[PDB]
Curated annotation (Swiss-Prot), chains A, B:
The lineage of its organism: Bacteria, Bacillati, Bacillota, Bacilli, Bacillales. Homodimer. Binds cooperatively to DNA as a pair of dimers. Transcriptional repressor of qacA. Binds to IR1, an unusually long 28 bp operator, which is located downstream from the qacA promoter and overlaps its transcription start site. QacR is induced from its IR1 site by binding to one of many structurally dissimilar cationic lipophilic compounds, which are also substrates of QacA. This is HTH-type transcriptional regulator QacR. It comes from Staphylococcus aureus. One of its GO terms (molecular function) is DNA binding. InterPro entries: DNA-bd_HTH_TetR-type_CS (IPR023772), Homeodomain-like_sf (IPR009057), HTH-type_Tx_Regulator (IPR050624), HTH_TetR (IPR001647), Tet_transcr_reg_TetR-rel_C_sf (IPR036271), Tscrpt_reg_QacR_C (IPR013571). Residues 1-60 form the HTH tetR-type domain. The keyword Cell cycle does not apply. Keywords: DNA-binding, Plasmid, Repressor, Transcription, Transcription regulation. The gene is qacR. Residues 23-42 bind DNA. Signal peptide: none annotated. GO terms for biological process: negative regulation of DNA-templated transcription. Pfam families: TetR_C_5 (PF08360), TetR_N (PF00440). Gene3D superfamilies: Homeodomain-like (1.10.10.60), Tetracycline Repressor, domain 2 (1.10.357.10).
Amino acid sequence: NLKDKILGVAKELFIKNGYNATTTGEIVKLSESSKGNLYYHFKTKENLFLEILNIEESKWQEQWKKEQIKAKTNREKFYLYNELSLTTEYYYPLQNAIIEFYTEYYKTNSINEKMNKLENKYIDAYHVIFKEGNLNGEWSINDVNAVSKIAANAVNGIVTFTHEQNINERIKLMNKFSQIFLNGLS
Amino acid sequence: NLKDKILGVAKELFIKNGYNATTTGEIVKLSESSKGNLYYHFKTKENLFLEILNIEESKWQEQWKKEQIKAKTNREKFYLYNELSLTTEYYYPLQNAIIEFYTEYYKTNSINEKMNKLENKYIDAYHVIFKEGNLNGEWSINDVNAVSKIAANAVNGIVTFTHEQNINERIKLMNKFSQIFLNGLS
Ligand SMILES: Cc1cc(N)c2ccccc2[n+]1CCCCCCCCCC[n+]1c(C)cc(N)c2ccccc21
């Protein structure tokens, strides 16, 4: 494909280097397409990156729906989602690139809108789990949105800031975190 | 002292122009030193920057040592340290150079090793709060080292990935997080 091999080489570059480290020159010299091509579907470079995120959050959310069956209670789904978070090949590997990205486009207005459209997708899985768990009598959260937002970011914190220590050490901490947290809700 | 003039000047240069754009030549001339002296004390730009981070971590510890006295109990120190990490990062000028430097050097083991020492010093403050809270009966935690690493990265996530929200909402969520988490310990 064309408008799909771009998105591919781009994802690979944003991860391998960083957001700025990868230039449109590079994406082209390895995705072979005149500068203009990258201009139709993808208006700007911040469009191509914001595009990659959407796909990634979708592939990830999709992977979780196909794996969440292995958890019977919402309590178990919480532990599971946070554990799988450390291993997916989806979305989470772009978090550094996203931190970089936001530091260099937070002076524009169309940024806080798109970076907040994704926010809703990103915390959705937690919203389901906490609401569904309210319905299933697993706990009683008065402010579901607040808690989903906290859970999502705290977890994104664990996944992102421990990216060097042995993987099983990380799963261990994440489980202790999921424990402290749900225990905190009831 | 010349070493300190070099560090002071380099810090300001990194802040005004960012990590990559600052040249050691600028650092050399503006501090009235030499490539030789700079090489002698730091070996490289990356090292210089890491040394600056060291000093910054120490000033931060000193500031905390003076601030925590406002918080009688450890439950309070925890609430306060988490709020301080969120509010003071909003206007910490080196933050930008820091993002730029990390999301570009976490691949090297030389650098990522030294960064971990820094990170570990930040985590220590949680260790102290948690150990001290044990000896005071504020809670009973059997795995202080672990809970400390979890708290630190959870908080960093909340501080780091929540930037699009309004400042009061972020402070509301950080406190709710502190409340949930401290409640999950008992
Ligand atoms: C004085 C002073 C004054 C303040 N008002 C202040 C305010 C807020 C914070 C520190 C402050 N300090 C001093 C602060 C010194 C901070 C030194 C930090 C070193 C390490 C960064 C580690 N790191 C890791 C592990 C993992 C990541 N994925 C990652 C991603 C992006 C960026 C960094 C990353």
